[PDB]
Design a protein around this ligand. Structure first.
Ligand SMILES: Nc1nc2c(ncn2[C@@H]2O[C@H](COP(=O)(O)OP(=O)(O)NP(=O)(O)O)[C@@H](O)[C@H]2O)c(=O)[nH]1
Ligand SMILES: [Mg+2]
Length: 180
């Protein structure tokens, strides 16, 4: 009935990049222009089908990007099946911080094979005006390759662009990690 081997997904990234917006666009297909800043760590669940015939339940964990609001530490990272690294295409420092988030996860999630553990990078706010978008796709692809050929998706939680495609890959990678 209730107890399931869920697929545990952690979403990480700087404050302001749109992690909460992405979680709500994925799980509830809704977008609110103004969410409160996230404090601690909470999750939502979504039942999904992976690649046509596998049913699973995703547990998507949303986290606090601001250090003053990280009041739960990082122990909840353990047991994760996939880690999502979000940057804002309009914010260079959020992009520059992607590897430190990857590495923070790796130190504390106690995964057994860091080299094969699935990461997915999301460059969010691709709907922004072109003049505001300062992180290039080319630059993002270079980083994703350098971190181990991790998948990169450009998204908009606001306009519902590519969040479904991205989480299709998050779900398939999570399931593969969960079952291997
Ligand atoms: N243009 C645009 N703005 C977005 C998009 N997604 C989120 N935003 C804005 O980015 C801002 C931060 O969004 P939010 O989801 O709360 O970010 P967060 O990463 O959860 N912040 P925190 O880490 O503090 O909880 C808000 O102003 C939000 O409206 C998007 O796809 N496009
Ligand atoms: Mg948030």
């Amino acid at each position: 009935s209730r107890k399931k081997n869920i697929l545990k997904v952690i979403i990480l990234g700087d404050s302001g990049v749109g992690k909460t917006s992405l979680m709500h666009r994925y799980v509830n297909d809704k977008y609110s222009q103004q969410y409160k800043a996230t404090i601690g760590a909470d999750f939502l669940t979504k039942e999904v089908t992976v690649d046509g015939d596998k049913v699973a339940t995703m547990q998507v964990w949303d986290t606090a990007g601001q250090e003053r609001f990280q009041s739960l530490g990082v122990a909840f990272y353990r047991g994760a099946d996939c880690c999502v690294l979000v940057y804002d295409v309009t914010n260079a420092s959020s992009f520059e911080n992607i590897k430190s988030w990857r590495d923070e996860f790796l130190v504390h999630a106690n995964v057994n094979s860091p080299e094969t553990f699935p990461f997915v990078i999301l460059g969010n706010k691709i709907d922004a005006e072109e003049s505001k978008k300062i992180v290039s796709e080319k630059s993002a692809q270079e980083l994703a390759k350098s971190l181990g050929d991790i998948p990169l998706f450009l998204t908009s939680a606001k306009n519902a662009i590519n969040v479904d495609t991205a989480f299709e890959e998050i779900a398939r990678s999570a399931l593969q990690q969960n079952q291997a």
